Design a protein around this ligand. Sequence first.
Ligand SMILES: NC(=O)N[C@@H](CC(=O)O)C(=O)O
Ligand SMILES: NC(=O)N[C@@H](CC(=O)O)C(=O)O
Ligand SMILES: [Zn+2]
Ligand SMILES: [Zn+2]
Ligand SMILES: [Zn+2]
Ligand SMILES: [Zn+2]
Ligand SMILES: [Zn+2]
Ligand SMILES: [Zn+2]
Ligand SMILES: [Zn+2]
Ligand SMILES: [Zn+2]
Lengths: 362, 362
Amino acid sequence: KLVRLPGLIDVHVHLREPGGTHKEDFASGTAAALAGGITMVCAMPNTRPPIIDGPALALAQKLAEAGARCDFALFLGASSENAGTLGTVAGSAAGLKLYLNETYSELRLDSVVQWMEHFETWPSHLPIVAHAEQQTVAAVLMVAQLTQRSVHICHVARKEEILLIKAAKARGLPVTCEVAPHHLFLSHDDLERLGPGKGEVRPELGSRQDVEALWENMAVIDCFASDHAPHTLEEKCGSRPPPGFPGLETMLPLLLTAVSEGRLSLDDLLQRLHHNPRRIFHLPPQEDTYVEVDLEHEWTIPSHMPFSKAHWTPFEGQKVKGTVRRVVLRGEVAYIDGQVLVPPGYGQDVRKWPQGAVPQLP
Amino acid sequence: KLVRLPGLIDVHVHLREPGGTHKEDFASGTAAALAGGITMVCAMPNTRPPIIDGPALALAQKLAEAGARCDFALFLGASSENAGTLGTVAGSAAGLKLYLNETYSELRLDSVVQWMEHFETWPSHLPIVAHAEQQTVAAVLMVAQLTQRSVHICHVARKEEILLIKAAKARGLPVTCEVAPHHLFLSHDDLERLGPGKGEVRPELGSRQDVEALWENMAVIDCFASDHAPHTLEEKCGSRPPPGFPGLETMLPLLLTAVSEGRLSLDDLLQRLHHNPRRIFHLPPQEDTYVEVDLEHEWTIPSHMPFSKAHWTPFEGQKVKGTVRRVVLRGEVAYIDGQVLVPPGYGQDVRKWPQGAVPQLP
Ligand SMILES: NC(=O)N[C@@H](CC(=O)O)C(=O)O
Ligand SMILES: NC(=O)N[C@@H](CC(=O)O)C(=O)O
Ligand SMILES: [Zn+2]
Ligand SMILES: [Zn+2]
Ligand SMILES: [Zn+2]
Ligand SMILES: [Zn+2]
Ligand SMILES: [Zn+2]
Ligand SMILES: [Zn+2]
Ligand SMILES: [Zn+2]
Ligand SMILES: [Zn+2]
């Protein structure tokens, strides 16, 4: 007896194309998405070259249209030089991404004034998401208030951060946030097993108290999103390990396990992987699209999942209950039982659909 | 220059069929919906007979399928005799409605134990909405906590009620709510003009301080919904005036005026008339469906709007800026400039669509 879910949306993925295609490309990352029950992804701009201007966006759009197997939207990235220059293309992007801390990106902004300039110049009706850890969450919230608009906080990982967001929501401030599965299902207790290289991620793995605070404050979490951040094992185990975990293929099985254990409800899951992504990012429905999952099948996560070119996973050895059996995307069987059955290029840029434009006043 | 909006959803309408068709029927009420930019309605169960058992629901479904011009879902109503009897049909309804105070209904429950019985027996994955005023909001929230599930509060009208809900959300409790336009745009200051008969509504019109508290606490309001409650002028002006206002044709123009004045944003409006209705009630997308509005046209609300059989409106004389120009429903022109162009029966029960079933564990 399978359960039919709507097409799930991951608003935070790194697909590495252009420029890092040994780690992942549109075709492989979207195969991983489909195998994870995800039918729409929003791809981050920290590629090589980074998606920080109109020519880079145009290239990325064509690479995605040719390689993606599920539907997508592409973020633009904020830089120290592009505020005020993105107005013509802004509405074609998922939103604008700000990198406000050290992480796998060359896009760090060096002054809060640059953050203000982006909040003032990016069109006010379009999404802004921020990588903002610890006190940076409070700082970017201040910039959002000064500029009288909303912000979405990426990968919240700490008790400190979720409680700050909780306090902001209690004051009626327009802030939303997402949490990634590694910050719900891994902690410092796992760094022994992972090692210091594999274990590198931003935000770093939290304490048990951080993990427990995120679960305790589930009501504050608007979205789940994988922060699928594929790097090869050679890179993760080498001398200068880049931060990030692959996660598209493991996210849904991990969360379904938690549903089966009563840690959150099926509805809680679908708000966070479907409805809230849609409404925060103004992402359109996908016609004739659904995911069938089997909630009874118990399995152990292996040393690598089948599709991501990362070819490793930090969840190796965890027991899960829940598997994706079939994905139908826009009337076509896209995935069955370990086989992806739509080719590279089946996926489409949802921002080009009539229903995928963000509504705005004339 | 028109603005394209998605198909808007009104989760609280009274269409009066069966049994009150001189006040409204499916055909006339859904024409009013379309003219108001609404493409999907959830119809309340306080009809004659009331929709409190499977035979009454079956009749109402067929009357709606034959008369509705926009899409719909039908609520079931809680009674003092039907707890534990609705399990077979529950998933075919919009949700379950509880009438917990005096209003236009014979469905009042006389004991909190009856509320508990409904919360315990209605399927836990399906929506429950409550007419719950003043302290009754706190009481039904207690019942929801005792039974470990969510509740949605209909037509919140008072500072007391919105602050209670705000406090509950700050504690992470699963409660959502809606507000009707008369509680945002009318107050005691209007009872002089309306008179005691026309002015009768439940919840009653609030003070200026109530209205200001609702605006100040917009962040707490999940949905707008009209509580379209048509009664004829003869009834409203007679000896025993029933409570309620018609509102489908005026809701969107009133709210667009507020958007134009900067009282809330277009996004704030679309969260409350599209995304949040979808996610709270698990209502499916409507393919090829959109509303085109003109935000520049200034007009004065007349003594009655064209479509509702109520043939009166409490907003007469208010100046608005914003009009519905065209509605496309599932690929067909449904409304243009004062003319409805889909016949009775074009509308469909969204709970019968594959994408319209509420997901549940096996
Ligand atoms: N989270 C990570 O550790 N890495 C992400 C970047 C990011 O989301 O900050 C990546 O692109 O590799
Ligand atoms: N609100 C009202 O005053 N009347 C509504 C009933 C209701 O929503 O309580 C009606 O059906 O007439
Ligand atoms: Zn990040
Ligand atoms: Zn993010
Ligand atoms: Zn990232
Ligand atoms: Zn939207
Ligand atoms: Zn009511
Ligand atoms: Zn209601
Ligand atoms: Zn009502
Ligand atoms: Zn749903």
